């Protein structure tokens, strides 16, 4: 807790959606958009496996389709934009050990854990899956996590899967392990 407002506790990350009619080319562009204004919509990111879809995430009802099971928590239905993306932040329960992300995306993204980037694509791309380098968690518990992802137009997809067993199996980040505040969620 960092201010005088109570924060919703749920088994998910705090999600913000931002749209723009400018071009998003890279992580810096999307982060500047996030910085420039209040979110166009907020939502609870409880099942982080979004898309695939076509014909721009920022148009029509494409954001709702993309977010699927998390769209029922949208604060509003944003108007049309050409480009858009999401900023997620909260906590993820991880035991101490070694992990790595494998992320399928169109366009780019960046995931950080405890302040350190652990999966980065700093450019636009048609759908592509990267197996990222491993990282360590030093102490079991809720780890701080944030993510950004965007769509510059066209197709869109975002599924960042995590392995705890050296890339033999991967899981989606969902309500089993996510927390909005770092307290234990019970529903
Ligand atoms: O050039 C068009 C294509 O550009 C790529 O980088 C992706 O953003 C696609 O979703 C888009 O359709
Ligand atoms: Ca607060
Ligand atoms: Ca903002
Ligand atoms: Ca809309
Ligand atoms: Ca879906
Ligand atoms: Ca739902
Ligand atoms: Ca664009
Ligand atoms: Ca795209
Ligand atoms: Ca392990
Ligand atoms: Ca496997």
Author numbering: 5 to 191
Q: Paper's wording?
A:
MpPA14 (Marinomonas primoryensis PA14 domain) lectin is a domain of a 1.5-MDa adhesin responsible for a symbiotic bacterium-diatom interaction in Antarctica. Bioinformatic analyses indicated the presence of an ∼20-kDa domain near the C terminus of MpIBP that is a member of the PA14 family, which is a carbohydrate-binding lectin module widely distributed across several kingdoms of life. PA14 domains share a β-sandwich fold and the presence of two consecutive aspartate residues in a cis peptide linkage (DcisD). The DcisD motif coordinates a Ca2+ ion that is directly involved in binding polar vicinal hydroxyl groups of various carbohydrates.
